[PDB]
Scaffold this active site. Structure first.
Site, short mmCIF file in Angstrom:
data_model
loop_
_atom_site.label_atom_id
_atom_site.label_comp_id
_atom_site.label_asym_id
_atom_site.label_seq_id
_atom_site.Cartn_x
_atom_site.Cartn_y
_atom_site.Cartn_z
N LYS B 208 7.07 14.99 0.39
CA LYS B 208 6.13 14.79 1.48
C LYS B 208 5.73 16.04 2.26
CE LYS B 208 6.75 9.88 2.39
NZ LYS B 208 5.27 9.78 2.40
N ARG B 242 13.74 6.64 -2.21
CA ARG B 242 12.57 6.57 -3.08
C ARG B 242 12.15 8.00 -3.44
NH1 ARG B 242 7.25 6.78 -2.37
NH2 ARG B 242 5.80 5.38 -3.46
N1 LIG Z 1 8.76 1.83 1.19
C1 LIG Z 1 7.97 2.92 1.05
N2 LIG Z 1 6.84 2.81 0.28
C2 LIG Z 1 5.99 3.87 0.09
N3 LIG Z 1 4.88 3.75 -0.67
N4 LIG Z 1 3.98 4.84 -0.88
C3 LIG Z 1 4.16 6.10 -0.36
C4 LIG Z 1 3.13 7.18 -0.66
C5 LIG Z 1 3.73 8.37 -1.42
O1 LIG Z 1 4.21 8.17 -2.57
O2 LIG Z 1 3.74 9.50 -0.87
C6 LIG Z 1 5.36 6.35 0.51
O3 LIG Z 1 5.57 7.48 1.01
C7 LIG Z 1 6.31 5.20 0.73
C8 LIG Z 1 7.57 5.23 1.56
O4 LIG Z 1 7.93 6.27 2.15
N5 LIG Z 1 8.32 4.09 1.67
#
Ligand SMILES: Nc1nc2[nH]nc(CC(=O)O)c(=O)c2c(=O)[nH]1
Ligand SMILES: Nc1nc2[nH]nc(CC(=O)O)c(=O)c2c(=O)[nH]1
Lengths: 262, 262
Positions: B208, B242
């Site tokens: 990020k 994640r």
């Molecule tokens: N739960 C969760 N879902 C996401 N979906 N998409 C994104 C967008 C990405 O892949 O940067 C995200 O940051 C998150 C997150 O921090 N947390």
């Protein structure tokens, strides 16, 4: 917050703005050489310079006569060609004197002034910062952390009695020394306890054995595991981290620092 | 210690033995295709399989009609060719239904059931674990952490009222959403506070922006910085992380787990 700076002769290390990275110099002894050959010293200067470019703030350079023939030639070149404080990785009193003479700003005793008490005096004399690492010839602890702090304090006793100034003292838990795999994980999980003694702490866990024991990976595959130990250590309040992978560990330390707010 | 397991249909994730790694699937839309082409789905299965081999425990797969034409074809292939629970990354109620139908075991609402309250009902219905991430259309906080916990609780209200079971609820701080660079570092330094709400927490900070803001490195140079956020998160009690770099993050998580004693 520390109310003082680490005074290292020419250079001064501040213990509050960031975690200080100490890079381990790559000493690869030249055969047919007592120490000093162009190959040895040159390869050593290339590394020192390299680490310096990727984030290091300190360069750690590691019989009694051989040790001097090998280490002095490098401390001379590195100190001259790399503008960074140098620490001599030894426990022997003589080697420590020679090294500071050649240009070493810090002592790094892996035996906390206990195998050769005279080294504490060498440090007090030249008035250089000294690192007292925990160590012992056995692994029979009644209470790991309680005994670590007890042993460390005895190194501090030998140091202070020798004339060493409280401000020129740095502690190291001794991860990987006289400790079983499980005992090392115990020291890591309790590192913050060392902070009660009131001194800055240096953590040395780079590519060590207990990381292989956990991840089950050879020595050249312990970068992600070293990182984890480094991050947890900074989070438990370490001022310095002794690592091999200077480029990688610097970013992790820096990002850590931002998050904890150092 | 959790007194229950995350029930995901065929698979069951234990929240106590280790930190669960959720790998982000690499969706690269095929032109001249509404979704379903061999290229798209195949490349997707190769990644799912790859992450599965390097440590993942979950595979996160991310108009309203287009979204269904693209995501369904993959959830079908991945669920069939990779024995691992799948989560659908969306906030839309319809897409969530379709996805669980195609084989998705978990919902991942980046808007905590607030942009389309009906999705909470979709989750309650199919009885699947749901991830409520913090988010808002503004960054004007009176007290960051206090407001985060307040907003999160309101997502929990919408969820529970919809019939969602406390055991099928997972929280996410929403690092990188409606938060300034400094505010993200604040959430990281205070993550443990979310634990008071009594639910497992998922941390998503992989590569990020705030990591680039701190280290000053482009997106493909944030591996060491992601690691640091991951280690600090596990240390503050996260159950899931994640990430993109599944191989690297798994080792760090594992080494972390050993040290904290999870
Ligand atoms: N739960 C969760 N879902 C996401 N979906 N998409 C994104 C967008 C990405 O892949 O940067 C995200 O940051 C998150 C997150 O921090 N947390
Ligand atoms: N202070 C300190 N000095 C060392 N010297 N040499 C070593 C040996 C090595 O590089 O593995 C070490 O681990 C440490 C340490 O952890 N801490």
């Amino acid at each position: 917050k520390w109310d003082y700076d680490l005074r290292c002769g020419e250079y001064t290390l501040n213990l509050n703005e960031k975690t200080l990275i100490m890079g381990i110099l790559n000493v690869t002894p030249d055969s047919f050489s007592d120490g000093g050959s162009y190959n040895e010293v040159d390869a050593a200067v290339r590394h020192a310079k390299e680490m310096r470019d990727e984030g290091a703030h300190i360069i750690d350079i590691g019989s009694v006569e051989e040790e001097i023939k090998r280490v002095v030639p490098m401390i001379q070149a590195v100190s001259k060609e790399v503008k960074l404080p140098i620490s001599i990785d030894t426990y022997k009193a003589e080697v420590a004197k020679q090294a500071i003479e050649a240009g070493a700003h810090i002592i790094n005793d892996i035996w906390g002034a206990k195998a050769e008490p005279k080294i504490a005096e060498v440090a007090a004399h030249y008035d250089v910062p000294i690192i007292l690492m925990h160590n012992r010839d056995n692994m029979n602890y009644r209470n790991l952390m309680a005994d670590m702090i007890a042993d460390l304090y005895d190194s501090i006793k030998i140091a202070k009695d020798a004339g060493v100034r409280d401000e020129n003292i740095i502690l190291d838990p001794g991860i990987g020394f006289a400790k079983t795999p499980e005992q090392n994980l115990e020291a890591m999980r309790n590192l913050e306890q060392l902070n009660v003694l009131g001194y800055p702490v240096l953590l040395g866990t780079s590519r060590k054995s207990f990381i292989g024991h956990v991840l089950d990976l050879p020595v050249e595959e312990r970068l992600e595991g070293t990182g984890a130990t480094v991050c947890l250590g900074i989070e438990k309040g370490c001022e310095f981290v002794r690592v091999h992978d200077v480029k990688e560990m610097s970013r992790m330390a820096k990002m850590m620092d931002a998050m904890i707010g150092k």
